[PDB]
Design a protein around this ligand. Structure first.
Ligand code: 288
Ligand code: 288
Ligand code: PLP
Ligand code: PLP
Ligand code: NBG
Ligand code: NBG
Lengths: 804, 804
């Protein structure tokens, strides 16, 4: 209760932080609170893991190079049902829990959607009571902190562990060795991988609390550690493996250090998984072969993209070289164990490691990969005697010039299930990208539409909305989001609609406070919050948005008195350090913003803000305060998107193309309840066939012309007129994302948005239909499908009893 | 009470280690116990520091690059008076208290005597209730762990922080920036140190519990931290500053990284000291010049050797460049603040940094050093118009060829007190080494004979002896070691003498168990334990000991039946990685040992063991089991020695030269109660004048000849006959430590030792006189002198009611 919590807080402030109320810092208070809450996880964490051992349910291992977790404090309190009591305790202690919460560093061990999906999945799996484990890397530095200097992005090291992470638990007794380089000998006692350099893998466990169910799963993250002065200093080399997260989103960078990270997670993970298996005492541990026949019935490993592809040849290595199992058997058990999820579209995102590199670092794995390919191709040849080109198409090796390994191909042949993350995407993957494989193995390919956890992305980030909905339809929706359809009953309820708007109103107010204390700008709280937050990339097209912003600005100047719905345009996101065009687009946006925000004639009519350091904790703030969600990727480029789901769940209307999950959002809530626009996948194809001539649009649309000329002649960069020539050049001759092609339809759609915004009742009526139809987008629904059609496991509804 | 301790232990095992009795590891139990004990320090640590703030007593800052702390668990329990109660709790919990304690890593942030003295001082100052602070570096890696492979020393990284250090407390809010490189600007506003690279200094506090007095002082250790991928990885460079402890004992290695460590500690320390001064509510602090007038009355900084010499020019820099104080005033306050302790007269040990290096790394400090020197020399010139050479002799700069800074000279002119660590040593420092300075400033030089804490080095390491003594004379001796003189009353008490021998007997038994489980050898528990443990160095002469060992071996072979007192010769210690001769001497010893231990004719008559990885925790084991302590440094080379004091306190007889504190040990217990031998300081001088011709001894002493020929011809290295030619060459033509010169007298003394050993009553009667006269060697006595004659502080003796 409140009294015991205050007592605990004081106890930790004293014994754990070694402070008293007159000397304690804000960070000390945060730590005291964190520990007070953390103590409540222990009992259930221990019992949960003990339960999995006793009952031996099939376990799920989500293997990923990224886990975009954000902060843990508030999420733990909520899932533990502790928030209001801690709220009261901290208040009575004379402190502000909200300020204590801001002390916590984000666990930004991810780039964006891919990493955040893993995070949402862990929460859902814990809530569904599944015996699930998250396996990743404990990066000393996560996604860099972003600063904006003189309009340009500036990176700063994310030293998130500097003062200690109370949410992680070092597990010394489970340390393991990982091998690199060396050579291989095929002796008469099996093949041996020798002369290798060893790097220790130290696991750190972080509790994953299920929502109100006594289940507490585990996220195990590995850190690299080394097994006269210069020699000691050189231990840094081994430790560099888990030093930093590669800041690339949808872009493959074949650096050797990255390959080392991939094998690192994979090696430690699989060895730890096998150790756990061989300790489970599973039905008859009979020596030597020790069964392992039940391994696939007790273990499921999901490959989050191809980053951990090496897991396949690594399991084979363990089964064959160490466990001495016959190849055919090992391969069988291997396919039954692995499942691969594809999240990529762009050619530049595909992982293709040159063989030479892999030969040097992982000689034994290259051999195993060649053997897998050999057996793979033999069969195709067996099935298609007269189709030579089919062989080069399906091989795991691309021989043309420099030889490379197609990691996706390896994942496909080593897994019993391959899934995309959205209907439109899964179809492209199955019928186009991997047509040669799906024809041969139809039933292998599936779709699993992404989802987001309604705990973090609703109960946590928008308590006001969560409360309002609960009051009307009960709390059942938290565990069964489809229940939101009940909200349809209030479609004509004016009072409800009024209450809905107030909540949004309240969120916008709180966020506007944030905006003003952070940026010199003054926000019109009456303005429509137009938001586009996500990683900066050309396919995302924040550039298209920028064109519309300039378009709006030019309209205001031309007619300073016309009827206009005021807007606050917010665009945020990080650009990969080496992504030149992305960095230029940021400076463009900041440039435009400086002109827009300071032009006296526009004044409070329109404000532009480049939201700095967009990350999970910040997302939890801006999303709830949004009116219009920008999801404008070129049709066919956004595999799924998840930010789109968060905005929909939080009371915002969507403006976007028929791409990724946007299509299913339209399916669920009705197309007229979303502002869809632009080319669709078939249109983009026709354009590519006919040939994209950007100038065409430029010379045919005056509003666009003025925008482009202004950018190109220096209207937004007077002291440096040709700053954006790179953007111009790409926009006119190398824009593979057809920005000008969707401009007109985009601007026309935008005007429609404004019209609806003038009608509060109609706007909120559409909002309600969106929220009421967002149920399918709960990651709980996603995981159920995975569990049922891929992992072959079963959700459990129980509860770790405590007192008596 | 025992019940609450068990309750607390279980609480921590659960909430802190996240384990239960069936899954907990030994490490986990150690941590649970460590936390249970640690909680007992909190109340008093907070109140002690609060008290210093409220009463504002003058503070003492012991600035050192080393603190050889050893383990903390047992020492804390003993000083807090909790050992029996905890011992009981662990027992009732079915746990082996011993096994838990062995889990703890030594905090080996020191090389040997210098670092251990700092550690003993912290304990004494806390016990004397002084407002003292230890300031050093938190090395990620301390003195390397030593292994012996194929008879040779092998180094392994001391990764002591790998699983966490419960005894340290990160103090985030006190982080500070340290500057390097850059350049000096001579502006209209004084000199500015611009364009520097910054390294953050993160302080970590470790509690220092006084013995049974409620006082808990602080040891604050600093760690370096950095303020695309390659850039992130390169943060390792800044962090390398506090990465490893330079493993040199009495040897100067002028590496740039070492210079960086020295400035690092100094910069962070002084800035933190000034910050604290400013916040101490003191007689109104105007501004600009926060007066600092009272700084010297509130602050005392002891320079542990010249390693932190930069502290002098750093304080001046702060006073002048930042606090804007006039030079004359700053210099005055500076001298009143600093005191310098000289810990060695060995030439190769003297710190002399080349100016070029200092100019590059610390340009502003080089300027300040030149100015100090200029004002220094001007005066000498003023006082000695006609003594030019006196100027080159007293200058802080040695211009001859490559220019260097004499750091000891800098420390002398910047301090109001300079002390040696033993009468014989302090005299050499004052009348010879720094004659030019002492004549000018007589009263500046002092002596402060070293000491060791009777807690760690008696109550902790030898509970049996401590108990026996307590039973006879009470427990008062712990806080007043001079009380041991009371033991003189039992000089003729046979029963007591018998009890004394039993205790030694028990220690030798326990240690013999250790020796056998670690080394294949079989120990004759009836043998005299002849021990020489300390860092390997030529001036220490473990080589001379080795010659005697070979001498004894050759006697056994020649007359396998003669009456002989059996001996177990133990020699241990680490050699600096780059000290070639030291490493050869180790291989020699291990070589000789292999021959001796396996020669059938000698059998149990004599056994030789090279004690591996000699360190504080191991010292606590071997010392209590010793019968004969080897302290045989060449007269005039061991400034003081402290190991000698530990052996004396623990029931062992000393064999040694009149060097360091050996002389005062002889003074205290009577020269006939110590086996003194060899050349004295005046003799070594005569020999140096006449010229040392080693061959002389070789051709005149047959026993030595056989020994040398055997070493030189390969008797101890058959498969490699000329392995020791380096030792031979140094022994005949470059032995500046006169090994052959003391050989005869040494061997003759050794025989005397054996004779006495045959008379148990006479031997233990001498032992009692030694123990009864070791009181002056308590570090409590040492600190009192420092406090009274240098720091001008007062040991406040009492106890503050806990929370009753
Ligand atoms: O880190 C924890 N305890 C401290 C610890 O384990 N430890 C030893 C690590 O090996 C410390 C004692 C000395 C310094 C490091 C820790 C406890 C805990 C409990 C939950 Cl529910 C979740 C995460 C957790 N981490
Ligand atoms: O380290 C301690 N507490 C933990 C802590 O301070 N902390 C924040 C460090 O900035 C942890 C919480 C999250 C992980 C690290 C600590 C407490 C303590 C008490 C005494 Cl008497 C002596 C040493 C000590 N160290
Ligand atoms: C910080 C962060 N980045 C990226 C994403 C993915 O968003 P989108 O689907 O818009 O790319 C989310 C969600 C997120 O919270
Ligand atoms: C581990 C250790 N090394 C070195 C020393 C210093 O010993 P000595 O005075 O024999 O050099 C001591 C004491 C010690 O405890
Ligand atoms: C490689 C990569 O980052 N892919 C991203 O993955 C997430 C999660 O599946 C998708 O929603 C998103 O559209 C896609 O761009
Ligand atoms: C430079 C150095 O490490 N000096 C050492 O200091 C200790 C502590 O004063 C002395 O006992 C010892 O004789 C001396 O060799």
């Amino acid at each position: 209760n409140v009294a015991e919590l205050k007592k605990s807080f004081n106890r930790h402030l004293h014994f754990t932080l070694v402070k008293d109320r007159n000397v304690a810092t804000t960070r000390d208070y945060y730590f005291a609170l964190a520990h007070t809450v953390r103590d409540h996880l222990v009992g259930r964490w221990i019992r949960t893991q003990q339960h999995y051992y006793d009952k031996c349910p099939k376990r799920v291992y989500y293997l990923s190079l990224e886990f975009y977790m954000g902060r843990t404090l508030q999420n733990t309190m909520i899932n533990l049902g502790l928030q209001n009591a801690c709220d009261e305790a901290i208040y009575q202690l004379g402190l502000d829990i909200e300020e204590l919460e801001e002390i916590e560093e984000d666990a930004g061990l991810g780039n964006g959607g891919l990493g955040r999906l893993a995070a949402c999945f862990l929460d859902s799996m814990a809530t569904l009571g599944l015996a699930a484990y998250g396996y990743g890397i404990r990066y000393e530095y996560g996604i860099f902190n972003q600063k904006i200097r003189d309009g340009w992005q500036v990176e700063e090291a994310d030293d998130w562990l500097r003062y200690g992470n109370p949410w992680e638990k070092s597990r010394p007794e489970f340390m393991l060795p990982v091998h690199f380089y060396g050579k291989v000998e095929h002796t008469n006692t099996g093949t041996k991988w020798i002369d290798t350099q060893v790097v220790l893998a130290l696991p750190y466990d972080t509790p994953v609390p299920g929502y109100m169910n006594n289940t507490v799963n585990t996220m195990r993250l590995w850190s690299a550690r080394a097994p006269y002065i210069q020699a000691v200093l050189d231990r840094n080399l081994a430790e560099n493996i888990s030093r930093v997260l590669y800041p690339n989103d949808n872009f493959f960078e074949g650096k050797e250090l990255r390959l080392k990270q991939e094998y690192f997670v994979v090696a430690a993970t699989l060895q730890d998984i096998i150790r756990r298996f061989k300790a489970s005492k599973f039905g008859s541990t009979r020596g030597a072969a020790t069964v392992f026949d039940a391994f696939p019935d007790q273990v499921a490993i999901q490959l989050n993209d191809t980053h951990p592809a090496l897991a396949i040849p690594e399991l084979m290595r363990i089964f064959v070289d160490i466990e001495k199992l016959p190849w055919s058997k090992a391969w069988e058990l291997t396919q039954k164990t692995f499942a691969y999820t594809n999240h990529t579209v762009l050619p530049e995102a595909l992982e293709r490691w040159p063989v030479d590199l892999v030969e040097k670092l992982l000689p034994r794995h290259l051999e195993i990969i060649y053997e897998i390919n050999q057996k793979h191709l033999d069969r195709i040849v067996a099935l298609f005697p007269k189709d030579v080109d089919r062989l080069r198409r399906m091989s795991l090796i691309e021989e043309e010039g420099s030889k490379r390994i197609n990691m996706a191909h390896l994942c496909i042949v080593g897994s019993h299930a391959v899934n995309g993350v959205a209907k439109i995407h899964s179809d492209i993957v199955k019928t186009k990208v991997f047509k040669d494989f799906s024809e041969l193995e139809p039933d292998k390919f599936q779709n699993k539409t992404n989802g987001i956890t309604p705990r973090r992305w609703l109960l946590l980030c928008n308590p006001g909305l969560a409360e309002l909905i609960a009051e009307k339809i009960g709390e059942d929706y938290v565990k069964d989001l489809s229940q939101l359809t009940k909200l349809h009953s209030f479609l004509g309820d004016d009072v409800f609609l009024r209450e809905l708007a107030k909540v949004k109103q309240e969120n916008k107010l709180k966020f506007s406070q944030f905006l003003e204390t952070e940026y010199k700008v003054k926000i019109n709280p009456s303005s429509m919050f137009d938001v586009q937050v996500k990683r900066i990339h050309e396919y995302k097209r924040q550039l298209l948005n920028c064109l519309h912003v300039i378009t709006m600005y030019n309209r205001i100047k031309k007619d300073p008195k016309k009827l206009f719905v005021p807007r606050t345009v917010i665009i945020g996101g990080k650009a990969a350090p080496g992504y030149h065009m992305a960095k230029m687009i940021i400076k463009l946006i900041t440039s435009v913003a400086d002109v827009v925000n300071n032009d006296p004639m526009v004044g409070s009519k329109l404000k532009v803000i480049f939201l700095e350091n967009y990350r999970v904790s910040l997302a939890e703030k801006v999303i709830p305060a949004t009116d219009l969600s920008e999801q404008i990727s070129t049709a066919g480029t956004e595999a799924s998107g998840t930010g789109n789901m968060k905005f929909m769940l939080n009371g915002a209307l969507t403006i976007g193309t028929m791409d990724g999950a946007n299509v299913e959002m339209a399916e669920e809530a009705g197309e007229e309840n979303l502002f869809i626009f632009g080319m669709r996948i078939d249109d983009v194809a026709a354009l590519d066939k006919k040939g994209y001539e950007a100038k065409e649009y430029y010379e045919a649309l005056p509003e666009l012309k003025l925008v482009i000329d202004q950018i190109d002649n220096g209207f937004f960069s007077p002291k440096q007129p040709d700053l954006f020539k790179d953007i111009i050049n790409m926009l006119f001759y190398h824009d593979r994302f057809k920005v000008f092609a969707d401009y007109e339809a985009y601007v026309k759609c935008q005007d429609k948005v404004s019209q609806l915004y003038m009608n509060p009742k109609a706007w909120n009526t559409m909002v309600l239909k969106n929220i009421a139809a967002s149920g399918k987008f709960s990651s709980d629904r996603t995981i159920k499908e995975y569990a049922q059609n891929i992992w072959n496991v079963e959700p459990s509804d129980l509860k770790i009893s405590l007192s008596n």
